[PDB]
Amino acid sequence: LYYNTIISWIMWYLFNSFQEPLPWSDCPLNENQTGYVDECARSSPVDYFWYRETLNISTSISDSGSIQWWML
Amino acid sequence: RVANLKPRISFNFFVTAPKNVSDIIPRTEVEKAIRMSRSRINDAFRLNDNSLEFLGIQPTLGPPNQPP
Ligand SMILES: *[C@@H]1O[C@H](CO)[C@@H](O[C@@H]2O[C@H](CO)[C@@H](O)[C@H](O)[C@H]2NC(C)=O)[C@H](O)[C@H]1NC(C)=O
Ligand SMILES: *[C@@H]1O[C@H](CO)[C@@H](O)[C@H](O)[C@H]1NC(C)=O
Ligand SMILES: *[C@@H]1O[C@H](CO)[C@@H](O)[C@H](O)[C@H]1NC(C)=O
């Protein structure tokens, strides 16, 4: 059940290739285009592709959001 | 007018009106003048905005994208 969910995360990283500025290589900017996003500046830009742009993870197991259509 | 030249290669400068020695151009107008021509000063010395730092002036722009 969960072993075929790890393969769906591997397929999401295979679809996100075929581009030379790789999506996990740089931070996005703010609303006001002056600096990077606040949790991409403290952590790594690779952590702001797995936790916020792929998973969109929350702060606990006790609150769950929605179905997150791109991982569906 | 250049002061305090060090070996690391650091100095201070301020700009003065052409023959009025008492007239110092303010710091806010020299920062706007350097921002207008920073790409031209970098090319004269082959530097790239991390090797030619004006302390107090920061690079700002550059939004990325292209995938439509
Ligand atoms: C040189 O610059 C100074 C300002 O740094 C000028 O002094 C001003 O003179 C006018 C009238 O003479 C005054 O109303 C201002 O208050 C003065 N400014 C200051 C800051 O005191 C001076 O006139 C300039 N000299 C020349 C020849 O242009
Ligand atoms: C950033 O820009 C947006 C415009 O989309 C504006 O609503 C917001 O107030 C700005 N933030 C700051 C801190 O100026
Ligand atoms: C997940 O992403 C959506 C938009 O893609 C956003 O509205 C939502 O707040 C995100 N969830 C969390 C927990 O940040």
Report how this structure was experimentally obtained.
Answer: cryo-EM
Where are the strands (E) in B8-64, listed by range?
12-13
Q: Is the CB of A68 under 6 A from ligand 3?
A: no
Q: CB of A25 within 8 A of CB of A44?
A: no
Q: Closest Cα to residue A36, out of A24, A44, A28, A48?
A: A28
∠ CA A15-A16-A18, rounded to 5°: 85
Secondary structure (3-state) at A67: coil
Alpha helices in chain A, H assignment, sequence order: 3-15, 38-42, 47-50
Task: Say if B67 is an interface residue toward chain A (CB within 8 Å).
Answer: yes
- Residue A40 CA to residue B48 CA, distance in Å, equals 24
Interchain contact, B61 vs A21, CB within 8 Å: no
Tokens for A17, please give them: 């290739």
Nearest CA to ligand 3 atom 10: A56
Task: Say if B60 is an interface residue toward chain A (CB within 8 Å).
Answer: yes
Residue count (chain B): 68
Contacts of B61 in chain A (CB under 8 A): 33
Q: Is the CB of B22 under 6 A from ligand 1?
A: yes
- Residue B41 CA to residue A64 CA, distance in Å, equals 53
Residue the block writes with tokens 């010395």: B45
CA dihedral A3, A17, A34, B25 (to 10 degrees): 150
Q: Strands B2-3 and B12-13: what pairing?
A: antiparallel
A62 alpha carbon to ligand 3 midpoint, in Å?
17
Interchain contact, A19 vs B62, CB within 8 Å: no
| Terminal-residue alpha carbon distance, chain B | 50
